[PDB]
Amino acid sequence: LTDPIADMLTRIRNATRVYKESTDVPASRFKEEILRILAREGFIKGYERVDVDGKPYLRVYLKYGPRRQGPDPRPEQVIHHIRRISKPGRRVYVGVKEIPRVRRGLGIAILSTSKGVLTDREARKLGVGGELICEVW
Amino acid sequence: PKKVLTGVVVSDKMQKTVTVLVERQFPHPLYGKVIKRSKKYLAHDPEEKYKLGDVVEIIESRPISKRKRFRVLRLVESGRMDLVEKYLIRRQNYESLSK
Amino acid sequence: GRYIGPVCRLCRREGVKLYLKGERCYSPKCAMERRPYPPGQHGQKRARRPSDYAVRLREKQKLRRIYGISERQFRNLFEEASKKKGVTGSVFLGLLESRLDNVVYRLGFAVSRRQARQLVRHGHITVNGRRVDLPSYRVRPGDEIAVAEKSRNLELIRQNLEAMKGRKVGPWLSLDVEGMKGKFLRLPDREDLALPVNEQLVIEFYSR
Amino acid sequence: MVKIRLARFGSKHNPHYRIVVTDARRKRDGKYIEKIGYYDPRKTTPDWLKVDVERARYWLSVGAQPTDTARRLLRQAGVFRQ
Amino acid sequence: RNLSALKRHRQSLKRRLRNKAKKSAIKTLSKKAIQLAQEGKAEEALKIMRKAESLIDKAAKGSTLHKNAAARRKSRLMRKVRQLLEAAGAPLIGGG
Amino acid sequence: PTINQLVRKGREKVRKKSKVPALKGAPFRRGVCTVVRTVTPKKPNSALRKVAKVRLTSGYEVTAYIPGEGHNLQEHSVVLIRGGRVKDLPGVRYHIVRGVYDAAGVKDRKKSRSKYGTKKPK
RNA sequence: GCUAAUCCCCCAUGUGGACCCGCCCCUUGGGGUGUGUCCAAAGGGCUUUGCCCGCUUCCGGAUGGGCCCGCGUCCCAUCAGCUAGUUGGUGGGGUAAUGGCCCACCAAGGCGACGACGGGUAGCCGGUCUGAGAGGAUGGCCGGCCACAGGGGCACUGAGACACGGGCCCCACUCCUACGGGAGGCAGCAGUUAGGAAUCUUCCGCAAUGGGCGCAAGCCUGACGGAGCGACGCCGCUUGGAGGAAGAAGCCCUUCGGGGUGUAAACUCCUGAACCCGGGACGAAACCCCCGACGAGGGGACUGACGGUACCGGGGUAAUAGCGCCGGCCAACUCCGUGCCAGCAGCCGCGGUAAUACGGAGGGCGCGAGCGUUACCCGGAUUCACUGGGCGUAAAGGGCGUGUAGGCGGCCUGGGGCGUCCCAUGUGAAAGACCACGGCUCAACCGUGGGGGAGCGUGGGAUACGCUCAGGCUAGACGG
RNA sequence: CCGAGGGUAGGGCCCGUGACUGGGGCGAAGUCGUAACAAGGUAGCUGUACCGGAAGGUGCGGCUGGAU
């Protein structure tokens, strides 16, 4: 496994697309800090540290919209979109002045900075930059 | 200031001179990724005290010879032959890239 | 220079009276009153559906034909508007308006912009005192647009000054007849002019 | 020596010099060492002359030599008032 | 077809004479003195060495030697003479 | 390709192949005609196209089109040429400029006259 | 053969400065000090026991430079190996100065897939052009650096040159001549010729800015300031304006009733480019002279190539329009002629007797002292794709393993802080560009002010992710 | 001594050109046949090999991208 982070985000996207209530990803005090952004910003209900076969995991509680009318009754997603930016193949770093506005504000860019994991909004607030972990909307 | 660089000694087969290999990273100007590039400096060692495997710092200095414009500033670590291997194995591999 | 030919065919092609003459524009001897179909052998033939391209060309040509201005000059203004702050469609109409010869025709000193040119060109006009005979002078707020003293006493300008006495003049202008002088109050809000131009279609012409 | 003089900018029949400190061996309109004011011989605006006077005294203090018709525009701005 | 650049060449030729002339002597003497100091012959070496040192600094007054050349020439003279005398010694006059 | 692959090999800016080499970077080039004659065009056309083989100041010898109805070109006719092939006569890649050197304009053109070096009439 | 000097030399004089040795600070050859040694000079002019311009040695400044280092700088790997002054060392030579820059000896090294060596192409930058941007393309004019001065080599003079209009030599070419001999170097401004698709007057002036010499008067200045030619470009302006028929003639169409050109013309009136007449600049106030003190300061005078031009006044004539296109893309349609011919053509395609596609015509569309064509650059081209593409069948998975370099890499904890991120500060010239204002009647053009940036140096700071060191783990992997 | 260059001798790369020659592209108004496309009238294609005026054929092995 070469990208624990992408692996997580993908475990989610994959789950969210068949409408699972939850899905578990292998635990990391960094992966957590990202989920701590994902829930706070209201993309997930939240997470809890559980265990599977003795091994530390993060069970992640997924969130969607109403049932819908039409021949396809499947609800809208709350996480419509989530994708790595920086990767191990190509680390992506931004100064504060060049942090992107995801989707006109309606989405976020989580970022690892030396003031911890922030959103665009949060980063610009404390006025620091860093590795741009990913984007969600 | 006088530019200072840190690197491994890869040759001591000269008298009063060592070859110090300095490495650096930098984002690719277009493709973003952090990439390494390295370069050998001939460093003045009047004392023949620096040896193969030494990780050292060298300081840009007034020219000593053609090609020698750095003196060894000071030792940093001893015995990194594992680096010297990296370099040497690459040179040795060159015998296979010919015709 | 400017167009200088049969001017009625213009209106006829545009399908709209543009008031390019002055007096005759208002009579029933107006071309568009007699033959409101396009000039030449084919105007009576049934029009076929104009292309999108067609449409925007026409709108631009019309706005341009009104001011009798050369296409280069038109263009240079429009660009000027695209660098200038705000809404380009506005500013463009505004900047088209702040031209001397238009202001002069706006303030009524002549019956046609065509006539209002030859007036500026023949040095019969002034701004803030000084004589100006450049039809393209970009007039700013505050500017006093007079008749030449030596030109005040002239038949044509008399007859044309007399026709202005109680005619009201755009919210962005003031006219002091007898005193033969007028004032550029501000740049025109779009509403302040009501030209048969969807100037939006113009921006769209130049974005191809 | 280092000199203080007029570099002609502007355009044809429309002079606009920059009183300027440059090396004597430069070309007229060349790289100057420092700009220190301007001069409009046609006098066509409220301030057709200006001089950083605190500066022009430094360059002088340290050996710059003004041209003739620069000396004047430095007198007229009273860099010489004792 | 004419100039005062001609004049300027005329003079160069003449300065050249005085220069070459001056530099010859300086070398002649330093060598003479280094030669003595090898087989030293202490007093005599030092005698000539002064005569060089004079001649060096004298050329340095003008365009012949740049003063640092003179410095450089002088330094290398003294270094040579002395260290030669150390295989035998001892310094008979001045100096120093 | 991976990002790495691109660090290693880069992307390749691809050059253009000029379609009028004989010009040698010139907008036009002078020449003399060797052969002046007619050529049959390819499917589905049919004609007797007028053509000159021209020897150039640029060392090259090419076939150039002679546009217009009728001309005055023969061997030794000095001619200016311009770029532009004639699609239906393969190998013809250049045009003779009428109205220049020994190539007359078209007698009696009224329309499109500049492209044919025919003067404004009475 | 003669004679002068700010020419040359000798001695004197030593604040100082140079050099060897010692010693103190400093730490590459920086500053100080003691002994020894060595080094200065030119006087000219006034109003003449006093000032001006010089001359000398030292120190600092300022400005201009030399050298050195990090990083950046195109195409071909069908160029993969290159290197004997080669890489290092010791001593010397040389220079302002380090250095294999040069030399002697010694050692056997230096470089290379992070692309050496080789070939090809190109002066580099500020910028310019395009592009939403990223990027691409480009380096003409202006500014900066470099390099060169018929092709080569060389040094001399000098603060500075290995010197475009200085010197030496060799070559190639041309010329002159009295036939013995000798001379040249426009890639300075003009100009000739050749080449070419193609690129200017053998103009005027030092009035202005600048430079050189001079105490100054001033002299020189093809730098420069201007004038000439050329729609080459951009910007500005003209060939008029108002009125004027249910609407002439001519010409085109026509179902022969009419439709078009067209308010277009005529004609009527108004203005008044050009032209004529008068006046007529800004650019020029310093230098100098006067008083004062040859300073500060006040006042006097000279001087304008452009140019009697711009411009101001008065008078005053209706006064150049051309080019492309009209099958679709693409805005603009009918008649005749032609009949797979003549021809058009950027792509698709038009023409074989009713062609909106050829040629002419009427009419129409687009621009207008321009319009078109050819060439080339970016664009459209997300068609080299970083932004921002792809590989079952469209072009595209290596025949398969094994493995070197490389690229990449699980969970937890600490140290370091390289990447990364923040702040401060220096640098980021000027012009250009962007925003504001202002001057030429506008504009173009031009001036003043403002706004920043990447990037790189320096100081400080942060530690999440990447890194690195250190210590744990067992989910990857390996083993029993 | 070094030294522009000159001379001698032998190498390397590149460009132009050459009797003749090999195929290639095109043209098309021709001769010969009909190899592929249908089970294309012998399923096709294929690497190799031998062979034949020519498309091609046959052997060996492979693929189905083969009709029934």
Ligand code: SF4
């Ligand atoms: S409006 Fe005036 S211009 Fe337009 S047609 Fe009627 S008359 Fe002619």
Ligand SMILES: [Mg+2]
């Ligand atoms: Mg990305």
Ligand SMILES: [Mg+2]
């Ligand atoms: Mg050395």
Ligand SMILES: [Mg+2]
């Ligand atoms: Mg109106």
Ligand SMILES: [Mg+2]
């Ligand atoms: Mg529309």
Ligand SMILES: [Mg+2]
């Ligand atoms: Mg705008």
Ligand SMILES: [Mg+2]
């Ligand atoms: Mg209106």
Ligand SMILES: [Mg+2]
């Ligand atoms: Mg556009």
Ligand SMILES: [Mg+2]
């Ligand atoms: Mg002289």
Ligand SMILES: [Mg+2]
């Ligand atoms: Mg001798």
Ligand SMILES: [Mg+2]
């Ligand atoms: Mg010298």
Ligand SMILES: [Mg+2]
């Ligand atoms: Mg000296």
Ligand SMILES: [Mg+2]
């Ligand atoms: Mg055909």
Ligand SMILES: [Mg+2]
């Ligand atoms: Mg020829």
Ligand SMILES: [Mg+2]
């Ligand atoms: Mg045509």
Ligand SMILES: [Mg+2]
């Ligand atoms: Mg005497």
